[PDB]
Amino acid sequence: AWEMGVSDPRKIVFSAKIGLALTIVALLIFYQEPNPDLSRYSVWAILTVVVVFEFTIGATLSKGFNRALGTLSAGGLALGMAELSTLFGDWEEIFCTLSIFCIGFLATFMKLYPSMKAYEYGFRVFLLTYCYILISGFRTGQFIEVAISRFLLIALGAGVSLGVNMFIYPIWAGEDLHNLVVKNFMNVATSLEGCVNGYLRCVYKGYRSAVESTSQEESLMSFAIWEPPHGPYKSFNYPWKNYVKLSGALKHCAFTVMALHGCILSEIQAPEERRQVFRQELQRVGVEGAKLLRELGEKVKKMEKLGPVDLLFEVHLAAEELQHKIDKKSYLLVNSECWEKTYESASALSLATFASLLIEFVARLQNVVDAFKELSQKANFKEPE
Amino acid sequence: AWEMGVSDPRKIVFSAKIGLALTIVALLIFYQEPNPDLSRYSVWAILTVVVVFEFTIGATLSKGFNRALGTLSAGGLALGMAELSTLFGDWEEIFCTLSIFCIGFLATFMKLYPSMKAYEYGFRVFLLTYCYILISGFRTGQFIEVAISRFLLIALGAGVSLGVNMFIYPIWAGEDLHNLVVKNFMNVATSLEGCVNGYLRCVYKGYRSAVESTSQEESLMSFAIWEPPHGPYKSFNYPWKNYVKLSGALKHCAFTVMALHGCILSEIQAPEERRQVFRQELQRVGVEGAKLLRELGEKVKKMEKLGPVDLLFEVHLAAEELQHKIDKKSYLLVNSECWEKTYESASALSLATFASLLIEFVARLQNVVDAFKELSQKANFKEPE
Ligand SMILES: CCCCCCCCCCCCCCCC(=O)O
Ligand SMILES: CCCCCCCCCC
Ligand SMILES: CCCCCCCC
Numbered sequence A, B: 001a002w003e004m005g006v007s008d009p010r011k012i013v014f015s016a017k018i019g020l021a022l023t024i025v026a027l028l029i030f031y032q033e034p035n036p037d038l039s040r041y042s043v044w045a046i047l048t049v050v051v052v053f054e055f056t057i058g059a060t061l062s063k064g065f066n067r068a069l070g071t072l073s074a075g076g077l078a079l080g081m082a083e084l085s086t087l088f089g090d091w092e093e094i095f096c097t098l099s100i101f102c103i104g105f106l107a108t109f110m111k112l113y114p115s116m117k118a119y120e121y122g123f124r125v126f127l128l129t130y131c132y133i134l135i136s137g138f139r140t141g142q143f144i145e146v147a148i149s150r151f152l153l154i155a156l157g158a159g160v161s162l163g164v165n166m167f168i169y170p171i172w173a174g175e176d177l178h179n180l181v182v183k184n185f186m187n188v189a190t191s192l193e194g195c196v197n198g199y200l201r202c203v204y205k206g207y208r209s210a211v212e213s214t215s216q217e218e219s220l221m222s223f224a225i226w227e228p229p230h231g232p233y234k235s236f237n238y239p240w241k242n243y244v245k246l247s248g249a250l251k252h253c254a255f256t257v258m259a260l261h262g263c264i265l266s267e268i269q270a271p272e273e274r275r276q277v278f279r280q281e282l283q284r285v286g287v288e289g290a291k292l293l294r295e296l297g298e299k300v301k302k303m304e305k306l307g308p309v310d311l312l313f314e315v316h317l318a319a320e321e322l323q324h325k326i327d328k329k330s331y332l333l334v335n336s337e338c339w340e341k342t343y344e345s346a347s348a349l350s351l352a353t354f355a356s357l358l359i360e361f362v363a364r365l366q367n368v369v370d371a372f373k374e375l376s377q378k379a380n381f382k383e384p385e
Helices: A002-007 A010-030 A043-051 A057-085 A098-111 A120-136 A144-167 A173-200 A204-211 A214-224 A241-264 A279-301 A313-328 A342-363 A365-378 B002-007 B011-031 B043-052 B057-084 B097-112 B117-135 B152-167 B173-199 B204-211 B214-224 B241-264 B272-301 B313-328 B342-363 B366-378
Strands: none
Touching (some): A010 A043, A010 A144, A043 A057, A043 B117, A057 A120, A057 A144, A120 B011, A120 B043, A173 A214, A173 A279, A204 A241, A241 A365, A241 B241, A279 A342, A279 A365, A342 A365, A342 B342, B002 B011, B043 B057, B057 B117, B057 B152, B173 B204, B173 B214, B173 B272, B173 B342, B214 B241, B241 B342, B272 B313
16 A cells, blocks of 8 residues: 555556546536436446556547547447338347347457457447437437437547546657667666576576567557657657567576576586586676676667677687686596486586586677667667766 | 368357247247337347356356356446435535446546456446446436346346356366366377477477466366366365366476477587487387386376386386486597587587486486376276276
């Protein structure tokens, strides 16, 4: 309660905005209209204000658009069917009751496909409006008054939500994508040092969050293409996809840290005395990789270009010293006695596995650097100077 | 869409069952009332039918219980406020708007907590019913005549939905969990064979499905506890929690196949001439591991116990043969002229990493066999005669 409120004040502003929007969609009902029935059709505005008010502006825009489309398509369909029913007499309330089964079946079948998982609420509003329009106006024949009334109540319930969301302390999805891209670099940098220290002593979230967030970055990128230009992002087509490309480049490197963490938790291990012969080189490689990842995160946070100097020189030299040391003491990994216990040999080879994995991690960084250069060039970052 | 219908005929009966329930509600409203009231309040039965129909019986029962608690908790609070607002005479219209503001704020703050994210469907029902029962009876005082005429249409909708869902082709979540476990056992074996075949040439779906579904198993287990005993699952408390343990053991075994697939896509690779020296042992270990996994999958599907003979003897012999072979040719993996280029040394050292990862995969199977024995004992599996 109070702890979460103090930690993040964005959710108290969100809750107060929802309260304000409801209090307005209620004062308008009380005073702006004295009609008796006006107060029974209040559910078509409250459902709208409870289904379209979202955390970000782009999600609210998308949901509003979808709801409008659904309602209009099903009001047109309902009107057309109600007209066409009269053609054959005596078949009334039977040819209207045989179309609800076919519309509900087509709607559900179309709603269960995997591609259409971002329109789940416009199919429900389509079915609800079709059935309501057909059933309500059957006895009296008045279908257009019901259609128009309900549509106006939905635009009256969606425009106050959009105004309140956009004008009182807006939250943007593009800035959330920018901050998640910044955060992943630090999580991976912490994970690598955690793994190396854990293996050399006498993590999970760091690589999991980067390896388990592609969907979040694709939804945040689907909401960011709806928002108008604002703040630091002034072009009319911001390259929001190069952020996803850089995030994927970083996930490809985080899979090796996941494999090193799995190397720490194995059934077959090596004697500590043997591992303490390579401590210096491994600690150097870990320090250099953490420095590089933190420098790339800092340069992405400030929207700056890369300098003239090469950033991978020191990590490359550290990995070359590691290779030289491994070449100088290779007699502690293989059994030289036999040359033409299984546990002892597996314990010996688990150290060569750990070293090979660290070298592969150091070899996968150039792709991340290239993706960063491409993003810094398409997004017009400023000169480091 | 026709193809999706032929691949899963389970999706063509759900749509026809929803259509049939909607048609039954339509007929009851059309023929069992001579007054428009049941036609004018007919949006509540349609909304209930579209909201409360789920793929499984246990999800329908649990979500219906949680949706029937929010409506009965939001219907008494609105009548207590509408009865306590009389005291504040004259200024009795501001106390009814400050309560919509307070309830809105509180319900959104509670819904934003990170442990309540799974119950976002009960807070919407609570907020909608409170706001409707407070904005609908304001100008007349008929607060108890608006909460009793709208609850029988929701009882009609819930009853029709429950009868049609439970009595026409019921779908059970325990069978879904059983089939998921069998499918994961098959997929891991196919991925294991694919990895070795791809490495020795002159995968994603399996481990990616068996490592990214724990949430699905937890949801299916949460739904299967509400269902009554049926078919082969005849017991008051079926041990549905012993399936998740076996799934977790299989996920721990599949992280090594994911590390071997990552070994295939590495930037540093070993020469083919040195790879072909160890072809026989790797092929044998792959054949044995795939046969063992498929045998355990067939034993799980048929609900049968393990026999007298040991199931791990041949894979345990193959691993020892591979170890002996590696011991006899270890001079091909290291440089023995420096004992006291980097790319060549790393390429030589990658083969030992592939071999060590296969040995670790072979070492992780005892835990899965123990989990299977525990499940076969707690669930009263039958003798494998
Ligand atoms: C999501 C917006 C609110 C939707 C309101 C319609 C759902 C009605 C509340 C659920 C009740 C269904 C459970 C059985 C109810 C009963 O036994 O009376
Ligand atoms: C204590 C009685 C609960 C009243 C809830 C009735 C729900 C009415 C739906 C608008
Ligand atoms: C678009 C045809 C007129 C009816 C639309 C009503 C929307 C509910």
